[PDB]
């Protein structure tokens, strides 16, 4: 077990090393080889550390009257591409070392999936099992009056997001503050945080986002004859059978969505139990019982088959659970053919060899969980240009679309003036929904998948470019660094 800071740190170190040779060859500015190679070895030392790390302390007054101090952190990994964005964690485990760590990932997520954001992360040492509906407000509404006074929250400088122990309810309290004290003289005030309640400028699909992100991740590689063959796998969701490592906000949806396209959810689990039914499991019923019973350990149409799901038959596995689900202490017990990581750091770097040595493909946790990030990047636009997506232009396409068919029909009337008479070219039931069920929702559902598409190809292009083969994690971090480098390389970073 490494430090999750150190464990991620080591990743791009590898990635930096690999691109290193290729990159000097690719740069063109006429310089000395050693110079324009020690150059990139120097820029790549700039990208590694975080550029700002803020520590705080709060005079919070409790409900009983007493006071207490709240150690709270904030780190912006790089002003590389403003505005920085990252979640806000509430947990006593939060330490400045971990905040630096995540800030790194958020900077490379955004690089992967091409969203113009830097990377941030912020924690506070609070166990929300202690405070009330009210003290949390007195805290969050204070943790923003601090950051804002020091330029670490603002629609153009930095944008918080939800994290564990940080629901919608919280992010409302933030915006309700920054848009009332400091950002008041700004048109873009409510663009300060994402994941707001849909009433106050949210996005439909902020919850199911990450899950439906995981989905379009797999669908961009399972449709690749260049890997499915090499993986010894048959292309198609309708062909394969998968499993799930829990029922997080991810699992509940990642399951259901992939469930919707014929891939058979073999088994599932819990943070405190196991479930197994090797012949397909119903999402919705679970979505009932896990909320009807507070646990599916007792879902009747399955079995509590104690044991790691990670050791159970599956053509696709989703470690949709918390940190470090895998070590090489079970790498000989994968039972899978393709693993697509759900949360950050589920696998040690160690076992990653063995999976390659056992010849499978473990899609990296970089961009899979980054489905949510893009959705935030959309809510940060919805709020930014002050208009629901496409409300301006919804009835327009509705008009034109079946004001276009009416031409095809009319144009067929030439050849078929009397053969069959009138020919009512009409939509279908489905294509009627995409007309009548028009909503910003479907824009997201659309824009989301396409970002994942163009992204996931940028990786398969990378793996081919460096013969990494089934080394996606590296290639990903390679593909991220390749991008972040371009920005510095041209910025003439020296502002003096």
Ligand X SMILES: Nc1nc2c(ncn2[C@@H]2O[C@H](COP(=O)(O)OP(=O)(O)OP(=O)(O)O)[C@@H](O)[C@H]2O)c(=O)[nH]1
- Applying CB under 6 A, does 129 fall inside the site for ligand NAI? no
Cα atoms found within 13 Å of the Cα of residue 130, Cβ hemisphere only: 10
412-471 positions binding ligand NAI, by CB under 6 A: 439-440, 458
What's the burial of 294, exposed, middle or buried (CB within 10 Å: 0-12/13-18/19+)? Answer: exposed
Instruction: Report the run of H or E that residue 14 belongs to, with start and end.
Output: helix 4-26
- Name which position in 6, 441, 461, 486 contacts ligand X (CB under 6 A): 441
Q: Give min distance, CB of 267 to ligand NAI, in A.
A: 11
What residue 173 binds from a second copy, ligand NAI, ligand X, none (CB within 5 to 8 A, per partner kind)? a second copy
**Rounded (10°) CA dihedral 188, 193, 194, 200:** -70
Q: Which two tokens stand for residue 218?
A: 């797999």
240-259 positions binding ligand X, by CB under 6 A: 252
Buried b (16+ CB within 10 A) or exposed e, 251-282: bbbbbbbbbeeebbbbbbbbeeebbbbbeebb
Backbone angles phi, psi at 121, to 5 degrees: -170, 145
- Name which position in 139, 207, 340, 375 contacts ligand X (CB under 6 A): 207
Closer to ligand NAI by Cβ: residue 295 or 409: 295
- Applying CB under 8 A, does 467 fall inside the site for a second copy? no
Site string for ligand NAI, 348-387 (x = CB under 6 A): ---------------------x--x---------------
CA 6, 12, 15, 20 dihedral sign is negative
- Applying CB under 6 A, does 287 fall inside the site for ligand X? yes
Q: Determine the Cα–Cα distance for residues 284 and 299; give it in Å rounded to an integer.
A: 12
376 labelled ligand-binding: yes
Closer to a second copy by Cβ: residue 328 or 434: 434
Which residue stretch of 33-41, 62-70, 109-117, 275-283 sits at the interface with ligand NAI (rule: CB under 6 A)?
109-117
- Applying CB under 6 A, does 247 fall inside the site for ligand NAI? yes
Phi-psi region of 248 (alpha: psi -120 to 50; beta: other; left: phi over 0): beta
91 labelled ligand-binding: no
Under 8 Å between Cβ of 374 and 217: no
414-433 positions binding a second copy, by CB under 8 A: 414-416, 420, 423-428, 430-431
Catalytic residues: 121
Q: Determine the Cα–Cα distance for residues 363 and 338; give it in Å rounded to an integer.
A: 7
Under 8 Å between Cβ of 111 and 15: no
- Applying CB under 6 A, does 487 fall inside the site for ligand NAI? yes
What residue 492 binds from ligand NAI, a second copy, ligand X, none (CB within 5 to 8 A, per partner kind)? a second copy
DSSP letter, residue 189: G
**Rounded (10°) CA dihedral 74, 80, 86, 91:** -30
376-415 positions binding ligand X, by CB under 6 A: none
- Name which position in 7, 53, 164, 412 contacts ligand NAI (CB under 6 A): 164
39 labelled ligand-binding: no
Closer to ligand NAI by Cβ: residue 470 or 487: 487
Buried b (16+ CB within 10 A) or exposed e, 397-425: eeeeebeeeeeebeeeeeeeeeeeeeeee
74 labelled ligand-binding: no
Cis peptide, bond prior to residue 83, ω within 30 of zero: yes
Q: Determine the Cα–Cα distance for residues 21 and 42; give it in Å rounded to an integer.
A: 14
35 labelled ligand-binding: no
- Applying CB under 6 A, does 116 fall inside the site for ligand NAI? yes
Q: Determine the Cα–Cα distance for residues 345 and 364; give it in Å rounded to an integer.
A: 9
Closer to ligand X by Cβ: residue 247 or 276: 247
Site string for ligand X, 150-169 (x = CB under 6 A): --------------------
Question: What number of other Cβ atoms are within 10 A of residue 3's Cβ?
Answer: 12
Closer to ligand NAI by Cβ: residue 3 or 271: 271
320-379 positions binding a second copy, by CB under 8 A: 378
What residue 113 binds from a second copy, ligand NAI, ligand X, none (CB within 5 to 8 A, per partner kind)? none
388 labelled ligand-binding: yes
- Name which position in 14, 39, 324, 328 contacts a second copy (CB under 8 A): 39
Under 8 Å between Cβ of 223 and 460: no
- Name which position in 2, 128, 197, 469 contacts a second copy (CB under 8 A): 197
Q: Determine the Cα–Cα distance for residues 88 and 245; give it in Å rounded to an integer.
A: 24
Chain residues binding ligand NAI by CB under 6 A are 81, 110-111, 114-117, 162, 164, 199, 210, 245-251, 269-271, 321-322, 325, 343-344, 369, 372, 388, 391, 439-440, 458, 483-484, 487
Chain residues binding ligand X by CB under 6 A are 204-205, 207-208, 252, 287, 441
Q: Annotated binding residues for NAD(+), as ranges?
A: 79-81, 114, 190, 382
């Amino acid at each position: 077990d490494p430090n999750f800071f150190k464990m991620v740190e080591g990743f791009f170190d590898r990635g930096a090393s690999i691109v290193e040779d290729k990159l000097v060859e690719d740069l063109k500015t006429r310089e000395t080889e050693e110079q324009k190679r020690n150059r990139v070895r120097s820029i790549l030392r700039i990208i590694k550390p975080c550029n700002h790390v803020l520590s705080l302390s709060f005079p919070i007054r409790r409900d009983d009257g007493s006071w207490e101090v709240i150690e709270g952190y904030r780190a912006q990994h790089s002003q590389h591409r403003t505005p920085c964005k990252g979640g806000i964690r509430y947990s006593t485990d939060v330490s400045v070392d971990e905040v630096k760590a995540l800030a790194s990932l958020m900077t490379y997520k955004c690089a992967v999936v091409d969203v113009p954001f830097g990377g941030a992360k912020a924690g506070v040492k609070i166990n929300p099992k202690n405070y009330t509906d009210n003290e949390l407000e007195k805290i969050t509404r204070r943790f923003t009056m601090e950051l804002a006074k020091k330029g670490f929250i603002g629609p153009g400088v930095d944008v918080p997001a939800p994290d564990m122990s940080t629901g919608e309810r919280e992010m409302s309290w933030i915006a309700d503050t920054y848009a009332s004290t400091i950002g008041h003289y700004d048109i873009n005030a409510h663009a300060c945080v994402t994941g707001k309640p849909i009433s106050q400028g949210g996005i439909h699909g902020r919850i199911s986002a990450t899950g439906r992100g995981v989905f379009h991740g797999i669908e961009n590689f399972i449709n690749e004859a260049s890997y499915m063959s090499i993986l010894g796998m048959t292309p198609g969701f309708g062909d394969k059978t998968f499993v799930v490592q829990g029922f997080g906000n991810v699992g509940l949806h990642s399951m259901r969505y992939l469930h919707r396209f014929g891939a058979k959810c073999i088994t599932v689990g819990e943070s405190d139990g196991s479930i197994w039914n090797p012949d397909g499991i119903d999402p919705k019923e679970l979505e009932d019982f896990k909320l009807q019973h507070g646990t599916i350990l007792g879902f009747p149409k399955a079995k509590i088959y104690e044991g790691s799901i990670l050791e159970v038959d599956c053509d696709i596995l989703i470690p949709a659970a918390s940190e470090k689900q895998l070590t090489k202490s079970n790498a000989p017990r994968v039972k899978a053919k393709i693993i697509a990581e759900g949360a950050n750091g589920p696998t040690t770097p160690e076992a990653d060899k063995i999976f390659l040595e056992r010849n499978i493909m473990v899609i990296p946790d970089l961009y899979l969980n980054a489905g949510g990030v893009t959705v935030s990047y959309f809510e940060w636009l919805n709020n930014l240009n002050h208009v629901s997506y496409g409300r301006l232009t919804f009835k327009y396409e509705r008009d034109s679309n079946y004001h276009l068919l009416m031409s095809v029909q009319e144009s067929l009337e030439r050849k078929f003036g009397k053969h069959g008479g009138t020919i009512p070219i009409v939509p279908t039931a489905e294509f009627q929904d995409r007309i009548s069920g028009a909503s910003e929702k479907d824009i997201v559902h659309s824009g989301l998948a396409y970002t994942m598409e163009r992204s996931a190809r940028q990786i398969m292009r990378t793996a081919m470019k460096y013969n990494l083969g089934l080394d996606l994690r590296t290639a990903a971090y390679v593909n991220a660094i390749e991008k972040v480098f371009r920005v510095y390389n041209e910025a003439g970073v020296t502002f003096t």
